[PDB]
Design a protein around this ligand. Structure first.
Ligand SMILES: O=c1[nH]cnc2c1ncn2CCOCCP(=O)(O)O
Ligand SMILES: O=c1[nH]cnc2c1ncn2CCOCCP(=O)(O)O
Ligand SMILES: O=c1[nH]cnc2c1ncn2CCOCCP(=O)(O)O
Ligand SMILES: O=c1[nH]cnc2c1ncn2CCOCCP(=O)(O)O
Lengths: 213, 212, 213, 212
């Protein structure tokens, strides 16, 4: 559908010493995958795409705690397009909280939702996500919005991992399709760390162990 | 310190001196605070924040009404400062969502309040975009303090100079401004001015055009 | 004509502890006059104005060694407007070198110019300046360009000091009209220092003495 | 280290993946380096520069052909790093202006060459946007070194991977790129693409449309 910028399994990303990384993360990473400014540029084209489709009207839906960073930037770029409209265009920002927990037994997925979503009826709703792996967060967000009978529904995600997709709702706007590696930085922390890391990088084993839980 | 004081005297800035979207040509009076000025002040606030709360964990709690632009920017500057620390400092970011009612701002209605007990024994920075009568905050302080945090500080982009004020003063003030109704940057008006970068006084023809 | 943003003699600028200033300049300044981002926003409106007038065509003329900073930013904003034109618009950047020396005796002003200005004939030329005080740099740049018979001539200056103007060519685009104080930062260094200072501030006596010559 | 190597293999990026001005829809083949990637790399180069030349004075010498965007950006990052130093480090910024002639790039024609003897006994960083055959630089190095600087390093945004290359290698490389003719960011084409943020390979219909 437009797989986004494809970062392939074959020799992925960039060597660490090529970009600016906080010294206190010198050992906590393997490679860098997507430098910040690269995220920005892509996110910019992405906002252009969104307006192509959406815009009757638009309710941008942010997924809380985690997804604020990418939402912020994506919306900054959109606000940027809107400044030139001949009529001022109302956009409404909306929020769901959503947390996940390790399943442990069974397989069974654990999702804890959101609250107050009256502002959804008959509107054009964009779901904004940080990353897609198993597809459950997306699937969860999907049926949740269909529940409030909107007009239109699209999913934007900065990241889509190249993994065993169960079958679902293929995202409409994809920032980057990346290898099956565990990534931190930009929008993805690891137990409260890496927030000051602007780039999407692969966490190392030293990092995982050091940044406990 | 009451932050950058913008006087009752000569208000702010003439509209044509800065870049504003054509669709708002009519909906404003003055520019109080251009976007970049907000950024520069915010960069400083972030620095003040680390001086008093740095090293320790800190839970950044955003008072989420209609947007979190300010929160977003404050945290980028804070993250920018934390890039230098010898040790990586973990930062917990959370939101407390308020819905609006009633004239009677002191009555808060929290919606997004997951484990409020995560706050217990932690260092909380509460981030707010504008303080007016001061009622919302002071009754929000009451709620928060019951979960006995180790310490609570408050940071507001804008503190309005009003008689209607009950005297609550934030620990970090971006700008002390005149008692006029402002929009822009982080303050929307019935879903409008979201794309306006600057803090500007809303005109009467804008007040009518966009009113709920 | 449009005096620009007026910073008046009466209680000018902001207290130092209100903005972010390099620690190594803690004592070398009195007040801050124009924070960086404020310069940016104004510069932005300024680029809009320029396009109003100019644009047949445009030759933006940069004054070398000193004026590169403001030129860079002003042109970045203009490039930004140009991206939306339906036809790609050629802009030509041009350069003069220009140095001044303390007069000492007489009064007599010393100006050392520039070289190769063939690309001036019949074009629309913008003179870009950092600051206007006595008006001589502007006057010098003026008669120099009139010498190559252009079509149109305008002066943009970020700063205009409120001082004894001798009489000349009043600038077309003014960023800020500021008090008669000695200012450093942003585009104005002091013997190689203050380049890392983004804001326009008033140099103190400690600063003057410390930053020798 | 040869900088960020962009392979002959899979070139760069599909045009529709990034934001490019509508008037160039037709005048390009691929995006090699999006603007923000340039910025991020440049931020690192600035850091590498300070590691080897920091503390000392350093004269930043920009090789000025048609523009100095890159120079401008490199110096902002350098100034950004210098904001932290205990002592203020004075930085001398100068330009050396070259005009173009003749196929024979090694023959330089300096125009803007005020006191070239200011370089004597100083630490010079020479900043260039693209290196191709390497002739311009190596004969520019000859000129500069005669004023006996204490030390000369060279920094180039782009080093082109060409057989036509005489083997000169800069001390700091932004990106090693394929042997294709690129425009954008800092490289204009007969006054065009100045407003193009990214490094992109120029198409043949763009080569014709804008040719001198
Ligand atoms: O690579 C990852 N870094 C950080 N968190 C990750 C990563 N991969 C998966 N996660 C968990 C959070 O996102 C899960 C997306 P879902 O599996 O589609 O619901
Ligand atoms: O000037 C205003 N612009 C936008 N919203 C405003 C303004 N003044 C008051 N409000 C509503 C939200 O501020 C109320 C917080 P409180 O009055 O301190 O409880
Ligand atoms: O306030 C100043 N800071 C730094 N340099 C300054 C200042 N005022 C004057 N100068 C000298 C450089 O500009 C001179 C402009 P002119 O006197 O109009 O030719
Ligand atoms: O790919 C190019 N884009 C724009 N200008 C280019 C390109 N390749 C060569 N030039 C001309 C300037 O570069 C020549 C420097 P030299 O060939 O190392 O002496």
């Amino acid at each position: 559908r437009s797989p986004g910028v494809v970062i392939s399994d074959d020799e992925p990303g960039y060597d660490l010493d090529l970009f600016c990384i906080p010294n206190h993360y010198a050992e906590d990473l393997e490679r860098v995958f997507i430098p910040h400014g690269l995220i920005m540029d892509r996110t910019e084209r992405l906002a252009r795409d969104v307006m192509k489709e959406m815009g009757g009207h638009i309710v941008a839906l942010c997924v809380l705690k985690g997804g604020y960073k990418f939402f912020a930037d994506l919306l900054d770029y959109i606000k940027a397009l809107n400044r030139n409209s001949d009529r001022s265009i109302p956009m409404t920002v909306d929020f769901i909280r959503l947390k996940s927990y390790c399943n442990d037994q069974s397989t069974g997925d654990i999702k804890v939702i959101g609250d107050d979503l009256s502002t959804l009826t008959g509107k054009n709703v964009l779901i904004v996500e940080d990353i897609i792996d198993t597809g459950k967060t997306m699937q969860t967000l999907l049926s949740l919005v269909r529940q409030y009978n909107p007009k239109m529904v699209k999913v934007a995600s900065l990241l889509v991992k190249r993994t065993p997709r169960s079958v679902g709702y293929k995202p409409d706007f994809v920032g980057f399709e990346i290898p099956d590696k565990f990534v931190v930085g930009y929008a993805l922390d690891y137990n409260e760390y890496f927030r000051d890391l602007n780039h999407v990088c692969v966490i190392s084993e030293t990092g995982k162990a050091k940044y406990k839980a």
